[model samples]
Structures are given as C-alpha cells and as structure tokens.
Target: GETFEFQAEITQLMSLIINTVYSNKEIFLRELISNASDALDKIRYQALSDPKQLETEPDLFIRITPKPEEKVLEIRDSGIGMTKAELINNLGTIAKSGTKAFMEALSAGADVSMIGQFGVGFYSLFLVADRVQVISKNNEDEQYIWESNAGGSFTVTLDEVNERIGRGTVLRLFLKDDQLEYLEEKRIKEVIKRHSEFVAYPIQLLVTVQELEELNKTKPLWTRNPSDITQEEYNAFYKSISNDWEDPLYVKHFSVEGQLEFRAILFIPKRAPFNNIKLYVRRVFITDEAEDLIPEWLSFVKGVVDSEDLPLNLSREMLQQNKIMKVIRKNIVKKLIEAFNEIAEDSEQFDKFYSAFAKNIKLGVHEDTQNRAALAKLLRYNSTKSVDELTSLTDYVTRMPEHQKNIYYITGESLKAVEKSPFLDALKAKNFEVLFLTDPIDEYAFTQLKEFEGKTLVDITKDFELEETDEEKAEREKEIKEYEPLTKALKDILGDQVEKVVVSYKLLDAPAAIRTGQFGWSANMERIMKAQALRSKKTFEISPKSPIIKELKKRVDEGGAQDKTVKDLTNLLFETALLTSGFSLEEPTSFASRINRLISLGLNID
Candidate 1:
C-alpha cells in the first residue's frame, strides 16, 4: 500500500474548509448523503444500459450506523463505488479530464458549506470528523480502504477481508470530541428530515435491535409529473409546507429546459402569506430561507423549485452564477404573472386577489421595470365613478371620453380622505372618472409609471390645469384676472405657508384644495415621510366660485394684505385645506389658538 499526497489545491481548500466561516456544520451529514445519493444515481443510470450493474446490491440504499464507544459514525451507500485509479483522481486531486468536476462543484456550493465546496463534499467530513476512512468496493476493482486525518497524505490499501457488503462505499467518520452530536441518532434524523427528507434513495439507520430502520421518506411531490398529481394532493402539499389551511389560489407545475433545466411547482396563495420558496439541487434540499431566491414583491409566493444542477461555476462554460439565480427568479416571476393573468380572466376572482395584494403589485410596478407593464396592467384602484367597486386603468381607459387625453388619479391617505376630496370636484362635474390612489405606495408607483398606453398619468392634486376649450380658456382668464387681487394678497398673508395660490379650474365646488408640484411629493407621501421624521413644495388652489373662498376673497380684499383677522381666516383656510388634502397641520396647536381667537371675535361681533 502506498501513501498518496493530496493535490496542493485540495490541501489548501481543505485547510480553508476547516478554518473558514462556512457554517451550518450539520449540513456535512447532508453533503455526505447527497454524495452517496449521487453515487447511487450513477449506478441507477448505468443499469438503464446494463441491468447487471446492480447485481451485487439489487436494492440501493444509504445507512447510517453509529458506534458510541468507538467514537465513529459510518455512512454507507449501495451504489457504484470507486476503484483505485478512480479514487485517486476523485479524492486525491483537483486535476480533471471532465467526467465529474467535484472541486468545481464544491466551489459553486461554498456558501452551502466547505464540504459542499470545491466539489469536495467528501472534504466536508472534517467539520466534525477527526479522521475519515473510506471502505469502497466496486464491480471494477477489489475492495479498498482510503484513510486520512486531513493533514497532507492519505493511504490507499487493500481491504483484505472484503466482507463489508456488495459494490458500494462506507464512509467512517471518527467524530471529534467536540462534535458528539453527529453520533446521536436523534441529531442525525433531524438533519436528514431538514435537508434530505426527499432523497430519491432509502436512508436506513442501524438501530439497537440489530435492524436497519428506514429513516427518510423519499421523493417530494414536486419531483413527480404534473398530470399524475391531483389538485387535492397539490393543495395538501401546499398546506403542509405553508401551514396555512386556506387553499392556494393558483398552482403552476412546469419544467423549463430550453434555457435552464429546472422543475418548479409554484403556488399563489388565496391571500398573502410568509416567504416560502424552497430551492433544491437534484432533489437535495438546499434552502427554504430564500430571501434572495425571489424578488421582494413575491415574498408571499410559496413553492418548490429544484434545478437538476446549478453549475455555480463551470470552468468550461464560464457560467455567471448570480445570473443563474436571476434566470430562475425571472422564470418563477413569469409563471406567477401567468397565473395572475389566468386568475384575472375572471373579474370577481381577480378582485379578491387585488384586494389582498394590491400593494405588492404597486411595489412591483415601482421596482420591477422589466415586468412593470405586466404588473401595471394588474393594478386596481378606488375610483370616483366606481365608488364601492374598484377600477383598473384598462377599464378607466376603456370608459375614457373620446376627448379625454390623460389618465387622472388622486392620491390621499385613504379612500375616505380622497372620496370627498375637492381634487375630484371638477372631474366629477365634467362627468369624468378620477382614480383614487389610497395606498401610500400608489403615489410612488405612479411616479415611475408616468404613462400607460401613451396616455400620461396626471395627478389631479398636483396639476389642476385641466383640458378646456378656447372659450373656457377665455372664461378662466377672466376668472384669474378677477381673483388676481385675492390670490396676490393671500400669497402675501400666507407667506412661506405655500409656494403660491392659484384660481383653480379643477375645483368646481370646494372652497379650496392643497396641491404639490407635478414632480413633487404628494400630501400622502408627505405624511408617510412624517411618520419617520416629518417632512414640504405645495400649492394652495382655491375655487373662485365657492361661497367660503368667495367670502374669504372678499374679506381679504377689503381688509388689506396685512390685516390680522382676514390673515387669520386665510391661515384657518390653509390648515383646513391641509387636512382635507391628506396633510396634517404643521402647527395644529397654533391652529387651536387661531380658532379660539376667531370664536372670541365672532362673539364680540354678535
């Protein structure tokens, strides 16, 4: 027997594995099982061409046997084990002619853990093992023993007794004194349940009664063909995984092979749920805490997406890694959007989804530029015309008057705030529908999606200069000229309180309305910012025709710009406009004093 030195690259990587911050040491057991299953896979596939390949061990399985006094745990598999040359090439070196690139696979799975890195799942044994011995018997070669303490050199010797088992491998891990947990049956079972519960092969544990108890419940539902599975079965799987009693609104079970080889069974819940995306590689469960697996907007989406293999870094292909995740994410998002489109074909059903997930769609519209159009199309909002029922931009556009050139929407704290808003006054007067954007995200989302189908989204609260005829323009000019003194004087009285005051054609009946600039923050956004630290450009547009404004205008004109009572009335009007316009009064306490003073003055007048 000759001692073979590990390849310099592998030795360095082993040291890195032992010293590195690559955590979740329990996954070492998972990696060992995954490798065992991988070996079993080779034999299973080999039997496809030649049935005699499994002659020695007709039943393929993995067994975990613990020796407490011996301080060792053995993981054995019934599969095509490595011969002498095969063992040296696979375990001793990183040099490759490309049958299986273990080191490369390991590099791809580094964050997964050291054992999963450098294609050296075998290397992960060091996470707990003080020394590891491999007893492998293959159809091609005699039974052999490869042992290492992970220092420099390993020995490959003959297994002279050869009574171990059929063609397979037995990995004996001498458990570290500090890592006795791995030797415990309970700990081993927990790790298996968490990481390898759905392994394709049977995993049996050696029990005290001289019997091997099957530990794993193999084959997850997603691995099966879609047509063979029933809807109740799918719902049951979702219910079990998500812990939600409610059924999923839609389920998509599909396989992608053209660009990426993957099988995904995604479920859209009836209502929003927690993050529940599970990722697996070749049915080996990798992660369920998948924040990066999907876009944040789809955090409520739940399902299983398993890739045959994600070549984290294939040297020959020069594959980009994060892009791999992106392609998977994009595909998932595509399927989810497809499901939504299907559900949306029914308006009543779509309404329920919209009610539950409107904000998510809005967030997607704001952030997912690639899917913005699709997400935007799914948007629904409270509308002036649809009072009780919600309206979509498509519906609003369909119902748009032939002459209407813009999509008008008003943003406020809630439907209650905007429903009675003077912002909708002139739109209602002209028999035009105004979309009510009640969610705070609506204001931010619409800013990004400024136009839809070439129709610009116009915030009625911001730009009150609505479409009008030349005759109406002439009338507005006359009204502006008439109100110029009130506006000019009010601007001086409400100095710095507003950027400017204007005679608003959009305000048909209300005394006045507060507004931001076309590109500035909405009052709703201002209030949202207020929740954090408190946040301001603003316009005060007064309806020239309203009795309150008409009287206030008259009072301001008579009392002059600097007069106390008229300015106080102007201040009162400004604060009222602020509240009605979905903004909190900047000086609510001062507003109280002004009201008390007005009450005192009115009492004196009586």
Candidate 2:
C-alpha cells in the first residue's frame, strides 16, 4: 500500500463538500468532465503562444464509454496529462496546490466554495466508484497508469507506450453495487446536458437510444418573428424545449431597438422552477447556477434572451459587468410587463392565463418594484360589486363614478370575511367596486405599488379619505364636532396603541371599524415578517394617523355606542376588523362571550 495523507482541512472539508455543497450525486460526472474541458482549453491557449505544446496533442475531444455488464464507466479527454511526481503531489499530499489554504478559507466560511475550484474534482468519483484508474500520457514522457480506491492510499506505475492515441487523461471508474446506473450511457448524457453542455469547449458523447429520441431541438427559439409562429406551435415548442407538459400561462415576445439589438421570448410556465433563478448570458451559456438573472420571484418564466450587440467572446464574468447586457435585461423586463398589460385588457384570455399563474402575478407585485404598477393592472379578485368574478384595477377605474380620485380595496384572510367588513359596506352602498383581496401577498403588493395609472390605490380599512358634496360635508362636520367627547374617550382607551379614535365618512350601517396609517405595516406584511423573525426580534414602529378622525366621532354620536346591544355590536366590529388584519385576539373567550351575551340580551334571557 502506498502511504497517503490529506491536509487537516481537507479531512474536515470532505464532510462539508460531500454532504452539503453538491446538488446531487449525478453532478460528480459533470464536474469531472468540466475539469477535463478546462484542461483542453489550457492546452489550446498554450498552443497559441508555443506551437510545440501541440507536438503530443493528437486530437481535441472527450470520449465517454460505459460498460454496464462490467460495471465500469470511462471518461477520456485529449488534454495535458500529469507525471508520476505531479500525481503524487496532487493526490497523496495537499501542498503547493493552494488547496489547503483555500480549504482553510472555506472552513472559515469564505462562501466561494465550489467543488471544481479545488483541482481535486476527480475525488468526487469516490461518490459512486469503488475503484478509479487514471491512464494518462504527456508528449514529454511515456504513458502511465494511476490507481486509487480513495482509502488513504494510491499507487502510480510506469507503462510502456503501447499506443500514442492523444495527449490527455482517461478515467475508468469501477462502479459500486449501488451506483451501477452510471454505467448507462443515457444517464451519463443526462448528467452532461444538465451541467456540462454549455462548457466553452466541445463535448462529444456516445448517445443512447433514449438521448437520440429526446431531440431537444437545441436551437434558440427567440430569433424567429412571433408572427411566423402559431399559438399551438409555440405551445408545442415550449413543451419540447422546456420539457414541460403543461401549456404556458403567458408568452411575451418582442424585439428591443436601443443600445442593444436583441430578441426576447419569455414564457411564464404553469409552475416555477425548483430553483428561484435561471441562466443569464450575453451570447452563450455558463453555469445556470447564477441567481439574479431576473428577480427570484420571476424564475417561473422560461425563455431565450439573445442580443446581437453582445461580443461573441463574452465570458460569463464579463457579461455581468457589460452595460449593454444590463440594457438588454431592462428592455426584456419592460416587454414582459407590456405583454401582461395586454393580457389584462383581454378578459377571456387573461382569465385562462391568470387561473394558472395569478399567484406569480401577486409575487411580481410584491417583489418587482419597477413593474409593480404593471403587475397590479393584471390583478384579479372577488369584488363587492362583482360577485364570483375577478376584476382588475383598470376595470375598477373604468367603472368608477366621475370625480373619483382613489381606487378602494380591502384585504382579509377570506373573501367572505372581507365581503362582510363594515368598511366595504359603505363603498358597496354607493355602487363602488371594492376589490376583495384574500391572499396574504396582496396587501404587501398594494403597499409596494401605492397607486396605479395616476390614481391612488387606497385600502379602505386603513384610512378614511372621504369624497362628498359641500352640503353633505358641512352637515357631517357639524355632527363630528358634537361627538368630539366620544372620540377623545375612545382615544384614551386605545392610548398610544392606536393612532387615534376617529370618525368615518365611509361608515353607513356599521357601528365601528379599525384603521392603520398609510405607512403602518399591513396585515400581510406583519405575518410574513413575524414568520421570518422567530430567531431575531424585529421592532416595527406604528404610523400615527392624522389628528382628526371624523368617522369615529360620527358613529358614537349616532347612538351607535349606547346600549348593551349597541356596545356589543361596536366591540364585534372592532374585533372582527382586527382579526381580518392578521391580529390575534387579546381575549378570545370575551369575544365569544360578548357575542353570546348580545344574543341572550336581545332575547331577554338574562
């Protein structure tokens, strides 16, 4: 047995990289092939400067052969090969290769931990291979074979040159009983397609019947004019390229004519990718591992973005810093928003799309600030004026009475709960459309957008901004002055916890309601932040309301707060409003008891 030793950090790092860093066991082959491709790239670069590097370079290709019956898989590459002493230094001891220092940084949480960077990517074979053999030759010397079981010992033996096929390395991995699948060509090709297909160098694989049948139609589809394609053809193309069976929820196709010349065809899939990011490139594919291609919330979209203005040799790192690339990204996003806007205008078409992807639209509203207004235009929900149907903010604007300035909405955990809200009743009585937003994300989205198409988007439960004729306003102001004492009284009861005890211009049949300031945390924001802050306490300041709360004063003076029945009704109104806004009860039994007490008092059952 040949003695071998791993750096102290490598021993520790072995556990971290193997257990957590990798996405799957299948990625090992991809990483190994990627390393081989890099080696080929280096040899090509060296040949440019010094032609003698090509003396031993017989060919430039990667050959992968799998033998299931023999339970072995082989990967061969025509690139530079290492000598015996170099192999010993690389595999037996971890000195001078920068791996030990790099691992030291990784263990200290440096965060740039990638398996390929260590130059020990070959070690990943141990994940599936019981024994791995390396056959290598360089033009400088005869051929050699290295053997290792990855069990702290490895051996290198000299070999006479029986064949001078190429200047490269070859790997023969004897699969473990549980890992025989690696010997199948179909599985190997799948591993390549997922991770190594976009390598800068050419990668050739012996395709199995399965891979031949898949026929991914590797050409990028966005280059064609949208008018040339039919909807059915586009849907079929999406299924073929994206490997998704479900039809696309929506498709955005447009060309940009600015700093960059490009075409974008983005499709919102029926479901989001498991990862919250997709590939970004100027002209080629790097690792799809990069995030921030679009917003994380928009990863459900699948499509092609190709730019004619980009350089052909735009490396993955360089494309990130390219101003033109950023311009392309901005234009593509705007085009996507434009496409959804068109869909929103078409009810029949949008209903079909939104039925599958409404949640994503809500996510876009919450996450993408630049496009929040556009996303809000596509929002659909149950409205008080329209039952069993969804209506957009634009539709609400179109149907609003003359002189209306703000589009009103209310949010609760349920449509039924929101429909029953006292805050909405006044809006409904005046033939107004109050959008009933039940999803927790809706409140947060509306908060981010604030307004759409020059009209304010106001939450009715939060503030009372009244619009009435001069005569009606004058009469209400006089009534509010009379109930100033009650407003002060309720304000004293609520104390610093509430902004103020207020009067309502929007109160019709209800005795009371609750409101938050424009800047206060909405119900949905409170719940989301609370969930995230379990390990860390977060303090959010309450936004104090304007000085006079006219609505609250009026309700008290209208005999809305006098008797046991009225008192019970008032408390229920406040409690139900609080509940709908994602707050827990201060006294659950009291709320229930109050409801019962009111029922008993009405029936004279003391």
Candidate 3:
C-alpha cells in the first residue's frame, strides 16, 4: 500500500468541500453521478477511435445500493475506469490539463455528454462520508482500491483479494454519524429525484436482492416537440424546475436550427420572481445566475434554455466566449416581445400582466436599446383618454386628430398630480388625449424612446405646440407681439433665469408658470435625482430650477427690478410656477411670510 499526502491547496479545497463547498450535502450524489456520466462518455468516445476499448461492456449506467445496517452507501458505474497513475493525479491534486483537453474536443464539434470537466468534483464525497473507498479496474492496468478518511492523506493498493468491477468504478461511502440518513433508501431516492432526475442515464437503485428500481428516468423537456407537450405537463415541469406554484402568465417555446441550434422554454410568471433564469448546455444544468442570458431588467422571467451549440467548458460550469450567446439573447428578446404582442390582443389579460411586469418592461425600454421599439409596444399607461384604465402608446397615437403630428405626454409624481397640472389645460381644451407617466422610470424610458412610429414624443411640460385656426393663430401672434415688451423686461430682470417669457395662450388660471428647457431635465426627473443624492449624501447636479429660483429671490432681496411690484410679482410668479410644475420651494418660510404680508396689504389690516 502506498499513502500520499494532499497538496497544500487541495487540503484547503477538501476542507471547503466537507464544510461549505455545496450548500446541501445531498448534492454529493449529484456530483458523483455527474462524474460517472463523464466517465461513460470518455469510454464511448475512446471506443469510437479504438473499437476494442468497450468490447467487455458496451452497456453504460449507474447503480446505487444502501447498506444501512453497516452504515454504507455504494454507488457503482459502468464506465472507463481510471488507472493507478490517473487515480494519483486525479484524486491527490486538482486536475486542469484534462479539462483543457475536454474544451478542445468541444471546440472541434464533437458531440459529447461529459459533465466532469472540473477535476475536483469527486471531493464532494467528503460532504457526507467519513471514509470513501473507490475500486476501479481499467483495460490496461490491474484492479486497484483507493481509500481515504479525508484527514490529510489517502492510500492506494492493488485489490488482489477480490476480482470484481471488470472495466468500471465502484464507490463505497462510510457515512458520518450525523449523516446516517443518506444510507436510507427513501432519502437516497429523494435526493436523486431532486437533483439528478434528468441526468441522461438510468440510475438503478438496488431495492432488494431480486429487485432493482430505476430511480431516474431522464427526459429532456426542451428537446420534445411543443405540440405534444400539454399545458399541465408544462405547468408541472415549470413547478419542478422553478418551485413556483402559480401558472406562468406567458410561455414561449421555440426551436432554432442551423448554425446555432437551440431550444428554449421561457416563462413570464404571474408575479415578479426574485431570480429569473437557469442556463443549460445540452440539457446539463450550467448556471441559475446567468444574468447575461437575459438583460437584468428581464430578471423577473423564469425559464430554461438548452443548446448543444453553446460552447461550454468540460465541467459544463463555465460558458466560453462565443458569438452564439449574443444571437441567442437577441432571439429570446424578440420572441418575448412577440409573445407580449399576442397577449396584448386580449386587453384584460394583458392589463393584468402589465400590472405585474410593467416596471420590468419599462426597464427593458430604458436599457435594451436594440429592442426598445418592440418593448415600447408593450408599454401601458394611464392617460386623459382613460382616467382609471390604461392605454398603449399605439392607442394614444391612433386617437390623435388627423392634423396633429406630435405625440404628447407628461410625467409627474402620480396620476392625481398629473391631472392637476396647469400645463394640460390647452391640450385638454382641444380634446387631445395626453399620456400620464406616473413612474420615474416612465420619464427615463421615454427619454430613450424619443420617437415611436415616426412621431416624436413631445413632453408637454417642456414645450407645447398646438394646432390652431388661422384666426386663433393671428390673435395669439398679436398678443405675443403686444406682450413682447413685457416679456423682454421680465427676461432682463430675470437675467437667464427665464429662457424666454411668452404670452398667456397655454395658461388659463395661473399668473405665470415655468416650462422646462427643450433639452433640460423634467421636473419629475430632477426630483428623482435630488432624492438619490440625499440618500447617498452626494452633491446633486446643478439644477436649472435652483438657479432660476436663486436669481429671482436675489432680485426680491435687492429690490433692483424696474419696480417693487415687478420684483414681488416675479418672485410670486416663479414660486407659483415651481409649485404648479410639481416642485417644492427651497425657501417655503419666506414664501409663506410674503403671502401673509400680501394678504394683509390687500385687506388693509396693518
């Protein structure tokens, strides 16, 4: 017998495996089964080059037998057995060279189902076992037994006593005191079903001397035809993978063939989920945390996408840098947008979906530039056309009059606040419907989707353009011409605070109101920025509203305007404009005091 010490790095690795590597100890079976599957794949590939390599046993499978009375759980596989040198190199240290070769074969277009690309998955045995014994026989080397208690060293010797395991491997795990439940038939079957139910191999559990029950009947759900899949079956499969009890709001199953062949079943849950996707390579689970598979905004979606064309490393854990992934992402987003369009045909159901997932869709509009137009079609908003109901931008555009060219919208803190704005009076008078964007994301997303279907999305709060009769236009021009002197005087007194003052055509009740600069931030966006800055204790960007208020307040203090009434009117006009445009005053106390003084002066109450 020869005993070998583990390398310093492997010692730490072993410790991690025993304590914290896998969150659940039951996954040890999954790791071991994956290793067995890879071993079978290796022998099958070798037999293709040399037909005699698998002459002894062409059948491949995994077997499990629990000897509870003796505190032992045995897992055996019919596969390409490791020689003495392989045992030393693979078990004593981490294996990197084997994985590199495995990736090379995949790059060469070899269709192989090997999951043990990583060399150290075998150490997961330490998660449940106090001691492990591996008996392996190879075609080239004599049968050998490897045993380890997982302390610091392990021993390997020739198994001269028993002539068993002709051309494969058998593992015997001596369970720990607290891990005796792993030796139970029920527990073993449950763990196998949960993690390895679709492992692409028959996992036979030894029930009795005369009976062997297959615990895993593997099936690739995505590989099957969608026409044959029943709704209940899809529901059950989704629940099995996602652990979500509710049925999906939407499902998109598609198969793409040719250079980048792939099958995907994407789900839009009835409610937003915390985590959204699982990635599989050739039906082998790779990652549930692949955020890049779909954009971060689409993280509320839950589903699986399987592709043999995906370039995965031998371990099937790391995805390689390849162009196919981008194609797959684009295809999925297109399919999802298409699905949303179909759902929109049923307005009531789409409304429910929008209520649940509209934020994510708006986020997609903001982040996914290429798919923005498609996602924009999925947007729903409360508008003047439907106060309590929601309307799509398409519907809003359809309702526009024949002469109207620009699509109008306004953003505010809420639907109630937006309805109360003074800016909407002119649009409402002409009976033109305007979209009320209540969410901060609405403003941000609309800013990106500047135009839809060739019509520019005009922010009514920033700039207003209305279609008028020639007479009304002439009357407005005459009013503007008369107010030009007052406008100039206000502009001079305000001094860059007011971009330009205009006559009272758009306003009905207010004395004066502020409009956003053509390219400036909307009032709602400014509020969001200020809130974010306050939370992080960072200086907010210079706000256009602040400098305007500061200059007007300076004139009020210095009394330097053309008259005291002009200064007072200017401050009051800016204050009311700020209030009407959904902004809080920076000096609310002074404004309140000035209002009280004006009321006293008007009433003659000294």
RMSD of each: 6.1, 11.5, 8.8
- Estimate every model's Cα lDDT from 0 to 1: 0.77, 0.63, 0.75
lDDT (Cα) of model 3: 0.75
Residue 438 error, candidate 3, Å: 0.9
lDDT of 3 by residue, 483-590 (tens): 455555566766655556665566654455776656778777778888785651111111212344345445535644487667676666677777778776779997
**Per-residue lDDT for 1-606 in model 1, tens only?**
999985456567568767563366887887788778777867776687699898888989998889998999988899778889877877666433212543344433332211133455567778888798899989988889988888878899988764667889998899999999877788987888778777778999987667788866435686678989988888877865566789987788988887678888888787775247877665666666555578998887788887755664321112234556777777888888898888888977787788788888888898889989888888888797799877778988999898888899888767787788887768887778889887778877999998999898888877646677898899889889888888989898888978988887777767888888777787777778778654588888888778887777667566666786677677888898888887787777999998887788889955
**Cα-based TM-score, every candidate:** 0.81, 0.59, 0.71
Compare candidates 2 and 3 on lDDT and give the better one.
Answer: 3
Give the lowest summed-lDDT range of ten residues in model 3. Answer: 536-545
Once fitted onto the true fold, the runs of candidate 3 whose alpha carbons sit more than 4 angstroms away are 1-28, 35-73, 76-170, 174-197, 200-220, 243-245, 468-470, 484-499, 533-570, 595-606
lDDT of 2 by residue, 166-191 (tens): 68887888889997877766777677
- Deviation from truth (RMSD, Å), model 1: 6.1
lDDT of 3 at 312: 62
